[PDB]
Structure formats: C-alpha cells, structure tokens
Design a protein around this motif. Structure first.
Motif, PDB file in Angstrom:
ATOM      1  N   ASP A 123      -0.630   0.336   5.645  1.00 24.18           N
ATOM      2  CA  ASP A 123       0.737   1.627   6.098  1.00 24.18           C
ATOM      3  C   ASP A 123      -0.807   2.892   5.428  1.00 24.18           C
ATOM      4  N   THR A 124      -0.843   2.838   3.945  1.00 25.48           N
ATOM      5  CA  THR A 124      -2.165   4.272   3.362  1.00 25.48           C
ATOM      6  C   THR A 124      -3.938   3.475   3.835  1.00 25.48           C
ATOM      7  N   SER A 182       1.109  -0.992  -0.417  1.00 27.20           N
ATOM      8  CA  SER A 182       0.282   0.022  -0.289  1.00 27.20           C
ATOM      9  C   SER A 182       0.920   1.456  -0.031  1.00 27.20           C
ATOM     10  N   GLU A 183       2.401   1.293   0.703  1.00 19.48           N
ATOM     11  CA  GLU A 183       3.061   2.442   0.202  1.00 19.48           C
ATOM     12  C   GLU A 183       2.941   3.180  -1.232  1.00 19.48           C
ATOM     13  N   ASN A 184       2.992   2.309  -2.134  1.00 19.22           N
ATOM     14  CA  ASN A 184       2.751   2.347  -3.198  1.00 19.22           C
ATOM     15  C   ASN A 184       1.342   2.660  -4.175  1.00 19.22           C
ATOM     16  N   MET A 185       0.320   2.584  -3.312  1.00 17.44           N
ATOM     17  CA  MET A 185      -1.014   2.698  -3.625  1.00 17.44           C
ATOM     18  C   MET A 185      -0.644   4.495  -4.678  1.00 17.44           C
ATOM     19  N   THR A 186      -1.259   4.562  -5.526  1.00 18.04           N
ATOM     20  CA  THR A 186      -1.590   5.985  -6.256  1.00 18.04           C
ATOM     21  C   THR A 186      -3.034   6.623  -6.306  1.00 18.04           C
ATOM     22  N   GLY A 187      -3.131   8.127  -6.202  1.00 20.11           N
ATOM     23  CA  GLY A 187      -4.429   8.479  -6.297  1.00 20.11           C
ATOM     24  C   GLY A 187      -5.018   7.895  -7.583  1.00 20.11           C
ATOM     25  N   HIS A 190      -6.414  -4.455   1.430  1.00 16.69           N
ATOM     26  CA  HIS A 190      -6.060  -3.726   1.557  1.00 16.69           C
ATOM     27  C   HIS A 190      -3.938  -3.702   2.289  1.00 16.69           C
ATOM     28  N   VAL A 229      -6.351   5.000  -6.825  1.00 23.65           N
ATOM     29  CA  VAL A 229      -6.812   5.164  -6.118  1.00 23.65           C
ATOM     30  C   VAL A 229      -8.993   5.675  -6.256  1.00 23.65           C
TER      31      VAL A 229
END
Ligand SMILES: N[C@@H](CCC(=O)O)C(=O)O
Ligand SMILES: N[C@@H](CCC(=O)O)C(=O)O
Ligand SMILES: N[C@@H](CCC(=O)O)C(=O)O
Ligand SMILES: N[C@@H](CCC(=O)O)C(=O)O
Lengths: 308, 311, 311, 325
Positions: free
Chosen positions: C80-81, C46-51, C77, C54
């Motif tokens: 972390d984010t 999740s530290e690589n999830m991007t807007g 998920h 999302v």
C-alpha cells in the motif's frame, strides 16, 4: 445447494482433468464439479475441426437440466480463437467460461489454481447467464469477442484495451461492469450442430515489401477467405492490392483487419475487400469461417463484422 | 541563435498530397523554433514504403547529419509503417544529432488535425541540445517514443503510438520537453550496422501464427528465395506441428527463422524445444528490419541471436 | 561465487506476521541464486509505515551497502505504501548496489500467492551485475519498476504496479532479466539528499482537490504546524477559489505548497498565475516524500522547484 | 429531418482562448460564448439543428454541487420538451467526471446527455475542441445512443460517466476507463457501440433531485504515510455528513485514520473507504470502519454518497447503492 458445473479439459499448461480438480479441492465448495477429458493438446495445435467438436459437445452439455455451466481449460496461445468460436455457436444462456494459465502447474506462484477457482465461481453464478462466452484469468472476466492475449509471457496478458472487462473477481465476489453490445450465443444466427467441416481461411500479414506471391499461394490452395493483418487501418500496398484483386476474381472473400492490436478498420470504397470493424486477425478469421458456412454475400458478411 | 533543422518529407497524410513547403507555411510557428529547410525526399503513402527506399532515406540522413550546418532532421512520414522506417534508421544512422520521425493520424484538412502540433513538437525535440544521443525518435500526440519500442497500437486513434511495457522517452507539455528514460540498447553511433555502401537488402517475409496455419506458406516463401522468415507466433512464438514442418524445411535450405509474437508486446524467450531464433521483445515488423540488417553482416545464427538481445 | 544478498523485512502480507526466514525457506530456489541472509527490520502493515521508520530504514540500508560482504538488498514491504518508502530510499541511499523492494498482493497462505515468485525475481534482480546503478527498484509480477515512476494503480490486482507513461526499467521472463530503460533523473549516489544524521523529518500533509473542496482543511494544516502541503489537484493541479485562499494563507505563514494531480499520471506544468510550485510528473505521495527531503536542505521555493524537475 | 440538440455551455478550456496559438497553458477558461464555439464549427449544423444556451461560464475547478444541482434540473427541463432530442454539455475537463456522474444518477430521461470538453484551448494549434464537439453532437443526435446513461466524449471515445475519469494531467487522451473500457468509439463519422454499462442510471435510478435546493456536505481525505488524525477532527467540526477516504491500496487505514473514522462515525458521519490508486475494487472488510466504495474512485464516490444522503441514512442501503450505481 451448489451449482452443477462440468469442467471440460482440452489441454494447456494449467493441467488430467481429475488431477487438476483434486489439486484445487476448493472448487468443490463452489460447485458440484464433474471433470471430462475432451482432449489434451497444446493450444497452438488446436484446429477448427476440433473446436467445432468442442462447441457441439458444449451445446449437448448445456441442454441437460443437471448442468448449470461449463468451465473449459485450454492453453493460452489460442484460447481467444476457441472462445470466440463458441461465443458465436453455443445456443444457451448458461455460462461458458474458458480458463488457462500463463505459468505451468509446477511453477512457483502458478496462476492456474486461482484462475480455475475464479472460473468456477463465474460459471456457477446465476448473474453470469446471458453474457456470451467468457475468458477468466488473473481476476478478470473478458468477453470472448474483445479479449486477446496482448503479451507473449506475462500473467496479466489477457486485456481488451478499448473495451475493458465484463467484470472482475475480487475477494471471492464477482463485480459485473459491462454487457457487450454485440450478438452472441442465443441471439447468434450461427448454428453448426449439423456441420462436420469448416471453410479454409488464411491470414496474411501486412508490412513494407509484403509479397504478392503469398496471395497467389493462398489462391492456389483453394482458400475460401483471406484475412489481411494490415498496416494501420487495413492499408494495402500496391502488391497487396494486386493480390487481393486476384483473390476476389477467384471468388475468395477478403477481410481487411489490422496488425496494430486494437481499434476500428473503417469502410473504404477505394480499397478492395470488406473491413473487420474492431475484430483482430485471429477473431476475424473465426467469424469469416463461420460466415462462409452460411453465405458468400458480401453485404451480409460485412454486416456480420459490424454486429458480431 | 536557432538550431538548423531539415524537414525531410516522405509522404503521409500529415501532408501524401501536399508538398513539404505547404506544410511549413501552414505552421509558420516552426520558424520561431528553428531555421527550417524543407526537402522533398518522396511523397508516398507509407504502406508503399519499401526497403530499397528506406535504405536511401538512411543514406540521405547520414549525409545531412554529416554537415556542420545541420543540427537535426525531422522526417515526415505516414503512420502505418513509420515504426519500420524509424527502427531502420535507429540502427543505421551514424550520428548523435536528433532524428525525429513525425506523422499525423488525421489528414491536414481535417477538423482538429493533429499534424500541425505534431510537427511543432518534432522540431522542438530535434532542435533541443538535450535530445542528442537518444536514438531515433517518433513524435506524435505530445509523446516522444523510441524507434525500438514505439509501435502503432490502434488502427485509427490519435494516441495510437505507445510502448506499453517500455513507456516514452519523454513528453512535450506546455512548450517544454520532459525526458524520462534513456533506452538501454545499442543504436546509432554504437551500432555495427552500416549500409552507406549498400544497394539492396536480403528478402525477409513475415508469416502469421494461428489455428490451422498452413505449411504451404513456408513452401512459397522458400520457393521465392527469402533469406529470413519472421514468425508472428501464437503467444510466446509457439509453433503448431505444421509451422514446425515449415520452419524445418526453411532452415534446411539455409533460411534464418526468427520466432516473434502476434500478441503485440513482451518477450519471446529462448526455447531449446522449438526451431529458430527468438525475437526478444521485438515485434514482427521490427524483427524483420533487424533480421534484414543482420543478414547484411552475418549468417551465423549465434551472432544474429545476440543482435536481437542487444539492439 | 554467488552474490551476497540481505533480505530486510519490514512487514506486509508477503509475510502475512510471518518471519523473514520462513519466507526464504518457502522459496528455497533463492538460495541457488544468492547467499541470502534475513534481517527482521520491522513487522507492520505498510499503511502504518511512518517517515521516522523509513528514515531508519534508509540509514540501515546505507550501513549494509557500505559493507564489502553485501552486494545488494531486498526489502519486503506491504504494497500500500511501498512507493513512498521506495522513493525515499531512491533519494537517500548512497550506493550503486541494487536496492529492490518486493511485495505481494495476495497473502502468503492464499491459493496462487504471488509472493514467492516476486521474492525470487527480486533476489535475481538484486544479485545481477547488470542491475547496478539503476536507482531503487520495485519488483512484482515479472516487472522491474523505478521507484520514481512506479505506483500502485489498482486497489486489488496482481498487476497493479505500473508506470503508464514511463514504462518499466526491465522485465524478468524465463529466469532472465531484460533491461529496457535507464531513468533520466537524479537518484542515489547523485542525489543531494542525505539523512544519515537526521532523527526526524519535516511535517508535510496532502489535501485533495475536488468540487466544493473546503478552505478549512488548509486552516487546520496551518494550525498543526505543517512545513509543506502537497495538493492532489483537479486536472493539472487546478485550484478552486477556496483552495487558492487556503494556499495563499499557508504560503504567508511560510508553508511550501506543491501542486500535484489526483489524476494518476502526467505533467503538472508551471503556471505563474497560480499559487505554489508544481510537482512535474510526481504524484501526490511521491511529491510529499520529495518535499519532506527538500525541506531538510532549503526553504527557497526556486530551489525546491528545481528539485521537482530533476529528481 | 435532423435531430434537435441543445448545446448547454458551462465554461471550460473548450471555450478558452489565449494571446497566441502556441500556449496550451496560461489561457483563460470559460471566456468564449457558446455561439462563438458553434460558429467556429459550422459543420455541426449538418449533423443537427443546434441551439446554444449559456448556462454558466466558469473553469470547472470552480464547479460546485449547488450549481451541478441546477444543471441537472435544467437538463431535465430540456429533455422533457418534445422539441429536444438530446443535450450536449460543454464543460472543463478537470471536474467533468463529477458533474457527469451527478447527472448520470439524476437525469430522468433516455434521451442522450453528452458532456464534451477540450484539453487544448480553442485558440491553440491542433485544438481538440472542434472535433470533440462535433463527435458529441453526432452521439447526442443518434437514436442508437438512447438509454445508455450519461456520456463523456473526447478524442474519438464515448465513456460512461460512471467509469470514465481524467487519468493524465495534460494529454489529449487523458479520459480512460482502464478496467471498464469505452461504451463506444467514433471513427470515420460513424459510431461503434461496444458496451452497455451493467449499473443503474438515469431512468432506472432512484435518485431524484428535481425538487431539491441543497445537498449534504461530503469531504474527501487522503490516505498516506503519517496521515493526520486532525483532518478528520476538522471535517467533523465543520459539519460534514459524509467522508470519502482516498485510501492507501484497497482502502487500508492507518491507526490514525482509524481513530479519525471512529470519531466521525460516533458523530453520525458516514465514511466511505475508496482508493487513491486510480482503479479497482475496494472490497468489504468488517474488521475496518466504514462502508466501501466498490470500484468508485474518490470523486465519483463523493457524488454518490451526497446523493445517497438525500434519501437514506441506512448503511445497508448506502452500501447497496455503491454496488449497483
Ligand atoms: N503454448 C502453450 C503454452 C502453455 C499454456 O498456455 O497452457 C499452450 O498454449 O498450450
Ligand atoms: N495509409 C496512410 C495513412 C495516412 C498517414 O498515416 O499519414 C499512410 O500510412 O501514409
Ligand atoms: N494493507 C496491507 C496490504 C497487504 C500487502 O500489500 O502486504 C499492507 O500494505 O501491508
Ligand atoms: N482547469 C480548466 C481546464 C479546462 C480543460 O482542460 O478543459 C477547467 O477544468 O475548466
């Protein structure tokens, strides 16, 4: 080589001690473990006479050169009473770590296995010596003097809100944060290895309309001490004051604690009884019982409540 | 213009010794928030507050809120049992107008006494139209707690009133109210409990759970005619063999038993293997209040259990 | 009949690599609670999830919840984010059907892994009729948190997700859901934010507040075309003279500045003598999400400030 | 007789005043002198022989490492005197945890150093400053308070400078150490000590800045979705010696943050991975760039890294400092 750790089982849902050990074979990479079945009961049925025997057995084990520490499996509901009793009576600096589980051993995501691994890692670490008796669940190392079960049903229930944890276990490594500023274990004046029985001490709750007859009933059954789980900072209604004064006339020692869950009950000369400092009712009963095996002097007992 | 707020005084160190009018004049800023009237209901330390008096407090608040010239009521009270009085009124006050209990952990003469600001915040909360319909509230230390969740968690600190698992209904920061939650429980105008015609309440005692807990305390409670026993149990209302014997004797004599918890927080779940009803997330003091009120309406244990899941 | 629940997988160590069907079969008890269907949306830490991702997640959830054969959605998920993704959907999902994010602090292969029971609880929440209309939820460790209040408070513990001042919406104890609160904020079906036609989001960066904090980080953000800056301020969004100079330069270039707090909790109150808007009780990560969505609708600071007080 | 206590004033809301008593925000910090504060609380003179010294008068958000350095040096001078038994330092709440932890590492005495602050201005109704100051003086003057490290006292609590942090933007009870608790509490005019920190500090600390005039530059960068590589570039280009990363979760790093940290380390910048969460342990992970902050939050980690860089460049030594201080 590996430290030598005895896993002493008393019961609790975390559980057969050998079944528990083989269910978590990873403990054998952290220590040379030997299991001993001390008892097998739900901790709501643990009694002072059995806890006394537990402390005597732990003292014997730790006197041996081939024992580096002890892990005690126990039910969650009264682990804080058993742990605090041994905190005051184990005459060794070797680690004594109580462990328990909030979910049964068959449950999905049961917490018992990892709690046990952590307890063995703590008990086997040279840096764990001299810290008093510890309670290990959910990656946290709590002092027996401060830790309490704060929630009826959650995994994270064992907390010391004002005093924090002695340490935490994260990523197979122990992080020590605090040493408690109280007397315990080897510095403790309490030695019960020659005792066979304990003084009777009951706990009475404080609340609106609390009744005088519960003090009468306690007096009439010969209690030596009463711990009052008081409103706020050990405040007492006119009925509780009447009950406490009757109890003290018969020689019963009264300790005013708090039902709130946390904090200091301060001395107050206009109220009857001694004060529990930051001891909650369950811990205050343990300390008062042990104090009564040595003394009835109120000044000594009050100092004990400030220093243990 | 300004809301009309009655400050109904019961005692406590926020005053108790001083009268309500001494408190108001010590905090003249309240008059810029509301048109305030002081009424001295009682003047006792809250450890001496009793159910018969709380009953009269609820009846008096109901009369005040029935008036068109009363927009809300602030009740000054000692900290030690405010959570019992507030939850009683939470269940019995038949109005959407705000009822806000307020208290102080330091006496009014102390350096940095918290009473003045606590009172100012309570009046702002009671006078704000957005405060209606939220149940009875307890206001200290910039926090608005629900009477059903808030409890005194610390013997002696200013921040003692907390609801660890349920949080605050709102906070007051910089002369502004920030509402965060509405409680998902029945209260006030949707409550079945009505005590406006009552004179007495059923006797309910609380017994603690601990290692070596004695059967004789159950015997004593039965022999003195309790109608209910709230058990502040080990863990999730767990019961020793001695407590089980005591509860079985009480139930045989028709006493309703509620298993609560001594821990401070959380859910006591139903358990067929144990005697008695369960307190849901009600702590022992709140459970005693609800059980007393339940017994004024029913003796059916299934109805009482449903009350504990919904109030 | 059982509710129909889609388990929409995005990654995280709850499947750590592992497919969604393997996770479902690891907790076969979920099939007694619902008719479950796994859908692999992505597979990333999740530290690589991007807007941008999302955004697509929100659009896919809206498509699923529009169907009559879907009663709710569980989203696996990383921890972390998750609070960023969950709050984004909290503001953009146009349905009262439950959307429940779930995660695990221990990897699926670990001793006493928390993922299985977290997933089972999430499915119970998503399938319960009483869970409708409560906003987007985050479920771990027997707790139900609102996406607007819940945050990861500890780097490494199982109990890390807490809302210290607002508490939990509910808890899951003994295979039963206990609802405690409803959030008093706008969300989901009452939110003005709609991203169903968007393909990208405005750029918003976060700068920390601390002793000796540098002006050049504001310069850099301006040079790289941020539309908004969220400031994780000292205390209640306090700003050094260097931060004030940086914020004044950003606002002169049309950048919207939100003052939040690095502290972790509480209200940043209005202060007209300081630059920028204030984040209310939104922490920096949530404040960035709301600011991005606000900028899809307006650049008016007065309107944006009202958003921060109501969402 | 009474202990001799210097009250060393730097500013803050505790010396803040306003046009009325109803505004708890919109006041001005660092506007009242230390003697105004002492005279407002004359009861302090029954607890100690007090001497006020005006060190500075600023809002703590403007406190800087160069001034904190001089503060540590001045406190060391004061505690070297035989007629000083302890020091109370009045300070703004916003960065007191940074100043306090700096002195925690650099004060070369067992005499108590107690930071004190207020969340409400001195003119506010129910202002907390007066009682906080009295508690701090009681703590600083008690011989049982010696050897405990630097302390932060507000709201009846004694926190260690190493664990205590401002956890809430605006409440009186904001200073907490959720996992480590308080060293002690002050209830009924009596001090109750609970814990001793199991970390190095003060007289057992290797950090000594008494001869220094400047400190290494260390910046803090936040971790979040879409976090940008260009902030690392900017920090490198402006000559940081260290970067503290307020990371997602347990110091986790996006692909962009990894690229930025590798660039920083190639230029010799020391990277510490901390956490934005507020609490807990960032564990070692050799799969990731940089060192780890243990349980130090970003603001504390920045202080320790700055001080570490005054004496070492060895990453094994710096990592050990983060596990022991
Ligand atoms: N009442 C049980 C609960 C299960 C457990 O904690 O082990 C006990 O304390 O033994
Ligand atoms: N025991 C007192 C304490 C003072 C107070 O809380 O007001 C009471 O509850 O009234
Ligand atoms: N960095 C990982 C941690 C493991 C997890 O929470 O799933 C993530 O957030 O994906
Ligand atoms: N920003 C102000 C607030 C002070 C305080 O709250 O003590 C400062 O830190 O100086």
């Amino acid at each position: 080589k590996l430290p030598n750790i005895v896993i002493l089982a008393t019961g609790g849902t975390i559980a057969g001690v050998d079944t528990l050990i083989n269910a978590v074979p990873e403990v054998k990479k952290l220590a040379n473990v030997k299991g001993e079945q001390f008892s097998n009961m739900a901790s709501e049925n643990m009694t002072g006479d059995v806890v006394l025997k537990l402390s005597q057995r732990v003292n014997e084990l730790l006197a041996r050169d081939d024992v580096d520490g002890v892990v005690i499996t126990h039910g969650t509901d009264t682990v804080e009473e058993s742990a605090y009793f041994l905190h005051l009576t184990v005459k060794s600096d070797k680690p004594v770590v109580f462990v328990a589980a909030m979910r049964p051993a068959t449950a999905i995501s049961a917490d018992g296995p990892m709690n046990l691994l952590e307890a063995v890692r703590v008990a086997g670490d040279k840096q764990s010596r001299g810290r008093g008796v510890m309670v290990v669940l959910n990656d946290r190392i709590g002092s027996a003097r401060y830790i309490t079960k704060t929630n009826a049903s959650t995994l994270d229930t064992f907390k010391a809100n004002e005093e924090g944890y002695l340490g935490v276990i994260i990523g197979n490594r122990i992080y020590y944060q605090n040493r408690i500023d109280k007397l315990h274990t080897t510095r403790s004046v309490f030695d019960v290895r020659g005792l066979t029985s304990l003084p009777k001490v009951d706990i009475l709750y404080g609340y609106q309309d609390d009744p005088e007859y519960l003090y009468d009933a306690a007096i009439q059954h010969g209690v030596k001490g009463i711990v009052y789980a008081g409103m706020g900072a050990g405040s007492v209604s006119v009925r509780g004051i009447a009950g406490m004064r009757k109890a003290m006339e018969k020689g019963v020692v009264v300790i005013r604690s708090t039902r709130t869950g946390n904090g200091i009950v301060p001395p107050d000369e206009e109220l009857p009884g001694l004060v529990s400092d930051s001891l909650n009712p369950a811990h205050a009963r343990i300390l008062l019982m042990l104090a009564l095996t040595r003394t009835s002097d109120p000044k000594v007992i009050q100092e004990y409540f400030h220093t243990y």
